């Protein structure tokens, strides 16, 4: 994870060449309807338009500075669009941290147009150096790179199927298996017969069906139910960030440039934290970090998410932590409030407000109550 910086410098060099010298990508939207209004303006644009310098305005607002309005628009919109409320994404029943495409998104008939729009926004976020709070699986990113799903990819995705397919490959399954190139799935209460290739009444045999069976099955199973959604998303993304520019990246590296690091370094966090109304040596600050040191990786992910809106950190580390309009370091603000109160976050400012709790144990417990659930 060391030449990734150099890959990313090459990419952002080549993309700045992509930006036209003249013209702007103008957007004007209300804060209250940022998703729908951005959607309408952005989908009127040609891919060329999306590479232009951003010139953004919130309806009814003058705005301090264009650069700052633009960061804020990108931050807020990329935050909303990933919200299950809009119907495009959901968290896995299998894991409420993994983001996935909503397979029922078609209840909105224009759904594919919204997937295309989100793709474009993700592309513009990479183009302008912004990290989205992106919870997608690694095979999702490899699909974005134009790479085939592998049997290894099934370990997380479908762990029983993984075992089944590994067994098929590693053993002479002649006779026992008795399957064809037609796979069955229950969709919406109904059993669907899906042929993996023309005439899928070819029985699976050793005799070199089987390797092709597994490769077709695996690529079918990953995007199963979400093929059209994914395709539109990928198309929006690559209108902004052409696939040829990404040819030296693998899925792990793409994930890192899109949403940052999921491994939280507590030393980097500590060293890049600002203090308000509490000093480096005070109890509340000592106790906060003691709790963080005890917190496991899920608890740290929940804390980071609580305070900042995301559970991941910029590649550049905590010194690059993002507020709504530009860099804002993680901040602990000690407040004059009742000590029965929980910590309160302001995610726009990566700030946590902490009452003057009377012991570590009290701080520890109130902090856990705030971040679990
Ligand atoms: Na934030």
């Amino acid at each position: 994870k060391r030449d990734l910086v150099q890959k990313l410098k090459i990419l952002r060099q080549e993309l700045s060449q992509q930006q036209p010298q003249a013209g702007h990508c103008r957007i004007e939207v209300s804060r209250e309807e940022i998703f729908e209004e951005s959607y309408r303006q952005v989908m009127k644009m040609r891919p060329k338009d999306l590479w232009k310098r951003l010139m953004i305005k919130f309806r009814g607002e003058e705005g301090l500075d264009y650069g700052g309005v633009a960061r804020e628009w990108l931050y807020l919109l990329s935050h909303e669009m990933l919200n299950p409320y809009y119907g495009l994404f959901q968290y896995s029943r299998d894991d409420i941290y993994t983001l996935q495409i909503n397979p029922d998104s078609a209840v909105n008939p224009e759904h594919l147009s919204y997937f295309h729009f989100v793709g474009r926004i993700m592309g513009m976020a990479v183009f302008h150096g912004h990290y989205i709070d992106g919870g997608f699986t690694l095979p999702f990113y490899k699909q974005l790179l134009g790479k085939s799903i592998t049997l290894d990819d099934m370990e997380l995705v479908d762990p029983d199927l993984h075992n089944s397919l590994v067994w098929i490959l590693e053993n002479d399954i002649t006779g026992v298996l008795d399957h064809t190139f037609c796979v069955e799935h229950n969709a919406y209460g109904e059993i669907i017969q899906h042929e993996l290739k023309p005439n899928g009444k070819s029985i699976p045999v050793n005799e070199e069906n089987k390797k092709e069976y597994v490769r077709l099955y695996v690529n079918w199973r990953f995007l199963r139910g979400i093929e059209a959604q994914f395709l539109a998303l990928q198309k929006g993304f690559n209108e902004v960030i052409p696939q040829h520019l990404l040819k030296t990246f693998d899925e792990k590296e793409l994930e890192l440039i899109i949403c940052g690091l999921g491994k939280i370094d507590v030393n980097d966090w500590k060293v890049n934290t600002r203090l308000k109304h509490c000093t480096p040596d005070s109890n509340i600050v000592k106790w906060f970090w003691k709790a963080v040191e005890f917190f496991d990786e899920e608890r740290r992910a929940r804390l980071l998410q609580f305070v900042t809106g995301s559970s991941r950190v910029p590649l550049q580390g905590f010194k690059a932590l993002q507020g709504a309009a530009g860099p804002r370091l993680f901040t602990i603000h000690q407040i004059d409030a009742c000590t029965n109160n929980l910590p309160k976050a302001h995610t726009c400012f990566n700030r946590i407000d902490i009452p003057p709790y009377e012991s570590y144990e009290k701080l520890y417990e109130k902090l856990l109550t705030a971040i679990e659930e």
Side-chain angles (χ1 to χ4, degrees):
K1 203 196 81 63
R2 302 173 45 160
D3 307 330
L4 173 61
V5 171
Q6 289 202 320
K7 283 183 178 156
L8 182 50
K9 291 177 167 213
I10 294 150
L11 204 219
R12 302 268 163 77
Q13 142 246 90
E14 280 277 333
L15 290 165
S16 71
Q17 205 44 53
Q18 200 177 279
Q19 175 155 275
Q21 283 187 21
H24 292 259
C25 177
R26 298 172 160 75
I27 297 278
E28 184 183 21
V29 293
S30 70
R31 284 169 189 281
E32 302 92 331
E33 279 301 299
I34 186 167
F35 184 76
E36 180 63 21
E37 291 189 5
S38 302
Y39 164 80
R40 265 156 45 102
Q41 287 177 48
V42 166
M43 294 303 292
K44 285 160 123 282
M45 283 172 191
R46 299 159 314 185
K48 188 198 179 294
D49 294 327
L50 275 10
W51 316 330
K52 296 171 176 158
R53 300 190 180 180
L54 296 185
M55 183 167 217
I56 321 285
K57 191 178 189 298
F58 282 114
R59 301 191 140 100
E61 293 188 22
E62 162 169 20
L64 189 76
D65 163 44
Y66 281 115
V69 175
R71 288 168 213 131
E72 180 180 1
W73 170 78
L74 205 37
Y75 175 99
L76 300 173
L77 215 208
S78 64
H79 187 86
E80 287 310 285
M81 74 193 185
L82 268 18
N83 186 348
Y85 187 86
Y86 297 97
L88 304 174
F89 303 101
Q90 62 183 206
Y91 295 108
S92 26
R93 274 74 35 80
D94 181 31
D95 176 4
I96 197 130
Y97 259 84
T98 296
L99 201 56
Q100 58 183 219
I101 290 170
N102 177 13
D104 292 20
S105 64
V107 303
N108 169 11
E110 277 198 276
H111 75 307
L112 300 179
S113 197
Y114 289 85
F115 282 104
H116 192 104
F117 166 64
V118 174
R120 286 183 170 192
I121 303 300
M122 296 179 41
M124 297 179 74
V126 175
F127 197 92
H128 301 274
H130 172 256
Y131 287 95
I132 61 159
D133 346 297
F136 307 104
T137 61
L138 286 172
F140 174 93
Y141 301 106
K142 82 204 285 257
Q143 279 294 109
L144 224 46
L145 292 165
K147 295 173 156 261
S148 269
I149 300 321
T150 59
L151 171 60
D152 281 323
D153 301 334
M154 296 294 330
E155 242 162 304
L156 284 88
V157 171
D158 193 331
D160 289 342
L161 179 62
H162 186 240
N163 283 154
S164 291
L165 299 181
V166 168
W167 182 71
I168 285 169
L169 259 26
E170 285 185 355
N171 297 101
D172 186 345
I173 46 85
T174 310
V176 21
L177 184 56
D178 197 11
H179 287 168
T180 64
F181 273 68
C182 186
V183 301
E184 254 170 52
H185 175 61
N186 183 278
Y188 304 117
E190 189 103 29
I191 301 311
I192 303 298
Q193 293 311 145
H194 184 258
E195 290 175 306
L196 264 8
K197 69 181 287 173
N199 198 244
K201 273 52 109 282
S202 164
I203 256 107
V205 297
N206 246 56
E207 223 35 48
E208 241 159 348
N209 272 357
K210 74 175 176 192
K211 294 194 206 57
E212 178 196 353
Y213 178 73
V214 169
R215 194 192 68 248
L216 296 167
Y217 200 132
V218 131
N219 276 273
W220 176 73
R221 212 251 176 248
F222 176 67
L223 285 193
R224 183 173 73 190
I226 60 180
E227 305 86 357
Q229 294 95 139
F230 181 82
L231 185 77
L233 200 152
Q234 158 236 92
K235 287 181 177 180
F237 179 82
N238 289 316
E239 285 178 332
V240 182
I241 309 299
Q243 221 166 248
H244 67 88
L245 290 186
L246 264 19
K247 262 198 298 57
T248 65
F249 292 74
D250 70 24
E251 60 291 348
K252 284 176 262 144
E253 298 167 322
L254 187 55
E255 167 179 44
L256 288 172
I257 81 177
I258 293 178
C259 51
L261 296 161
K263 179 70 137 198
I264 290 174
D265 187 333
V266 177
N267 299 314
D268 185 42
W269 194 349
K270 249 187 218 176
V271 139
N272 289 286
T273 294
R274 287 288 155 81
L275 307 179
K276 167 156 282 269
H277 296 282
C278 56
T279 55
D281 66 348
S282 64
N283 288 349
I284 214 78
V285 169
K286 170 176 260 146
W287 294 338
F288 176 85
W289 292 118
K290 180 162 212 304
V292 175
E293 288 151 8
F294 187 67
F295 282 6
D296 59 23
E297 299 197 68
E298 182 183 4
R299 293 164 153 196
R300 290 173 183 165
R302 304 194 140 183
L303 179 58
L304 194 53
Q305 187 158 141
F306 172 71
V307 172
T308 75
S310 172
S311 68
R312 305 194 140 238
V313 337
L315 296 171
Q316 302 88 351
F318 279 90
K319 69 177 193 290
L321 211 62
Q322 301 186 138
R328 298 293 315 244
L329 296 178
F330 192 94
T331 305
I332 300 160
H333 173 33
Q334 180 168 39
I335 57 157
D336 199 8
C338 180
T339 66
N340 204 225
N341 291 1
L342 302 179
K344 262 152 217 42
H346 304 94
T347 66
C348 288
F349 299 106
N350 298 331
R351 177 164 45 118
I352 182 178
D353 289 2
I354 301 180
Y357 297 128
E358 299 87 342
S359 64
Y360 170 67
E361 181 64 27
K362 200 199 211 160
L363 184 156
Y364 176 83
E365 282 170 29
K366 296 288 190 182
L367 185 63
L368 276 173
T369 307
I371 70 163
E372 299 176 321
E373 206 70 20

